[PDB]
């Protein structure tokens, strides 16, 4: 396993797209998130 | 050892996509599951990772801690496998959960874009992407150490 630089961490004046969902989630000791009702 | 976006490869394939900053890598858990890390010649070990959080960084504590402000657009860093690094805005959505609010980005990229860094107007990253749920649209929460 390696890495390889891939770019800057910056903004950039990008396509935008996306819902913006609200969720009820609960998330678990193994780090799994799962829907809640 | 210089801060940016990075690929997280393995013998090649992508396997995720981490930060460095402050000379420490950060990835998420699932990606590298703790293992060392080759950058060139040197070696790259685990310090710190939790699971629950799946979250992980190498040489040094975890730097990031930005937080998503609850209004604004963010731009999700996607370096998927093959192609150049991407910044994708929107705006988050919310997980709700019993112990407060997560922001979450409704953004479905291959799974070697696991670690990418999600960032605030100032540039600054608030969270790493591909830890979520699928509501199939994959909803990933914006995990911030």
């Keep these: ?37 | 050892t210089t801060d940016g976006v990075y690929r997280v490869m393995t013998r090649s394939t992508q396997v995720g996509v981490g930060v460095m900053q402050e000379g420490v890598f950060h990835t998420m858990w699932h990606v590298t599951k703790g293992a060392a890390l080759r950058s060139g010649e040197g070696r790259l070990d685990p310090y710190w990772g939790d699971v629950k959080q799946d979250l992980v960084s190498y040489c040094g504590p975890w730097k990031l801690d930005a937080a998503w402000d609850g209004l604004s657009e963010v731009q999700l860093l996607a370096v998927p496998p093959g192609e150049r690094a991407k910044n994708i805005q929107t705006l988050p959505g919310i997980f709700k959960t019993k112990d407060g609010d997560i922001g979450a980005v409704a953004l479905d990229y291959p799974a070697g874009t696991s670690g990418s860094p999600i960032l605030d107007k100032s540039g600054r990253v608030i969270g790493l992407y591909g830890n979520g749920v699928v509501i199939g649209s994959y909803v990933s929460a914006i995990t911030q150490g």
Excluded: C, H, Q
């Design chain 1, 1 to 37: 396993m390696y890495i390889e630089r891939a770019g800057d961490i910056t903004w950039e004046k990008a396509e935008v797209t996306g819902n913006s969902p609200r969720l009820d989630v609960a998330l678990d000791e193994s780090g799994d998130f799962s829907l809640v009702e």
